[PDB]
Design an enzyme around this catalytic site. Structure first.
Site, PDB file in Angstrom:
ATOM      1  N   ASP A  64       0.803  -1.247   0.000  1.00 31.89           N
ATOM      2  CA  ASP A  64       0.000   0.000   0.000  1.00 31.89           C
ATOM      3  C   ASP A  64       0.827   1.284   0.000  1.00 31.89           C
ATOM      4  OD1 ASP A  64       0.691   0.154   2.684  1.00 31.89           O
ATOM      5  OD2 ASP A  64      -1.322  -0.477   3.401  1.00 31.89           O
ATOM      6  N   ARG A 122       0.987   6.817  -0.002  1.00 32.07           N
ATOM      7  CA  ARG A 122       0.238   5.795   0.729  1.00 32.07           C
ATOM      8  C   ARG A 122      -1.153   5.787   0.145  1.00 32.07           C
ATOM      9  NH1 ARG A 122      -2.769   2.698   3.041  1.00 32.07           N
ATOM     10  NH2 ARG A 122      -2.655   1.939   5.220  1.00 32.07           N
ATOM     11  N   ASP A 161      -5.816  -0.982   3.663  1.00 29.76           N
ATOM     12  CA  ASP A 161      -4.738  -1.472   4.532  1.00 29.76           C
ATOM     13  C   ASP A 161      -4.335  -2.851   4.078  1.00 29.76           C
ATOM     14  OD1 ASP A 161      -2.947  -1.328   6.716  1.00 29.76           O
ATOM     15  OD2 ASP A 161      -4.398  -2.210   8.113  1.00 29.76           O
ATOM     16  N   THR A 162      -3.106  -2.941   3.562  1.00 24.26           N
ATOM     17  CA  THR A 162      -2.543  -4.254   3.292  1.00 24.26           C
ATOM     18  C   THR A 162      -1.801  -4.771   4.501  1.00 24.26           C
ATOM     19  OG1 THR A 162      -0.551  -3.151   2.308  1.00 24.26           O
ATOM     20  CG2 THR A 162      -2.289  -3.919   0.762  1.00 24.26           C
ATOM     21  N   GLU A 168       1.387  -6.129   6.647  1.00 23.18           N
ATOM     22  CA  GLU A 168       2.802  -5.772   6.550  1.00 23.18           C
ATOM     23  C   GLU A 168       3.510  -6.928   5.873  1.00 23.18           C
ATOM     24  OE1 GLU A 168       4.195  -2.637   7.328  1.00 23.18           O
ATOM     25  OE2 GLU A 168       2.017  -2.350   7.276  1.00 23.18           O
ATOM     26  N   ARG A 219       3.911  11.268   3.707  1.00 19.68           N
ATOM     27  CA  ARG A 219       3.479  10.473   2.542  1.00 19.68           C
ATOM     28  C   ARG A 219       2.330  11.127   1.815  1.00 19.68           C
ATOM     29  NH1 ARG A 219       2.624   4.643   5.424  1.00 19.68           N
ATOM     30  NH2 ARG A 219       1.041   5.936   6.406  1.00 19.68           N
TER      31      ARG A 219
END
Ligand SMILES: Cc1cn([C@H]2C[C@H](OP(=O)(O)O)[C@@H](COP(=O)(O)O)O2)c(=O)[nH]c1=O
Ligand SMILES: [Ca+2]
Length: 129
Positions: free
Chosen positions: A15, A29, A34-35, A37, A75
């Protein structure tokens, strides 16, 4: 919303991606997702999916929403398109990201994203398996 030019500098993870935008290197971002980690389950697959999408693209575009364009880490916050296909939505549709971080005023594509999550969920894909 408006699509603006950018060029790939390098894939980072599911992401975040480093792009050159108005001639400056910036980490972006992806809005509304939300991917996992890299160290987590489906994390490597998410990173792989995004990498492939952005590296294979002839044309990358950045689309900012109506609100905040940078987060507290500096970001860029945007929807990212690879040859016209939104990466953010594509990750969600494949069950490689959850809809997340939905903040009022940067939520133009929330319904599109949620619709993709529902479909990924109904298919039991990846995170939803
Ligand atoms: C996606 C997104 C993340 N963020 C911030 C919230 C989280 O703060 P915290 O770091 O204090 O948890 C962080 C999660 O990003 P990551 O999922 O890349 O870790 O990024 C924004 O502020 N706005 C956004 O639109
Ligand atoms: Ca993440």
């Amino acid at each position: 919303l408006h699509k603006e030019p950018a060029t790939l500098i390098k894939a980072i993870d599911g992401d975040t991606v480093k792009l050159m935008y108005k001639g400056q290197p910036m980490t972006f971002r992806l809005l509304l997702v939300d991917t996992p980690e890299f160290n987590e389950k489906y994390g490597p697959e998410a990173s792989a999916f995004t990498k492939k999408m952005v590296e294979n693209a002839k044309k990358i575009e950045v689309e900012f929403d109506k609100g905040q364009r940078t987060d507290k880490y500096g970001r860029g916050l945007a929807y990212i398109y690879a040859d016209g296909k939104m990466v953010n939505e594509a990750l969600v549709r494949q069950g490689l990201a959850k809809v997340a971080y939905v903040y009022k005023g940067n939520n133009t594509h929330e319904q599109l994203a949620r619709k993709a999550e529902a479909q990924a969920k109904k298919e039991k894909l990846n995170i939803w398996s």
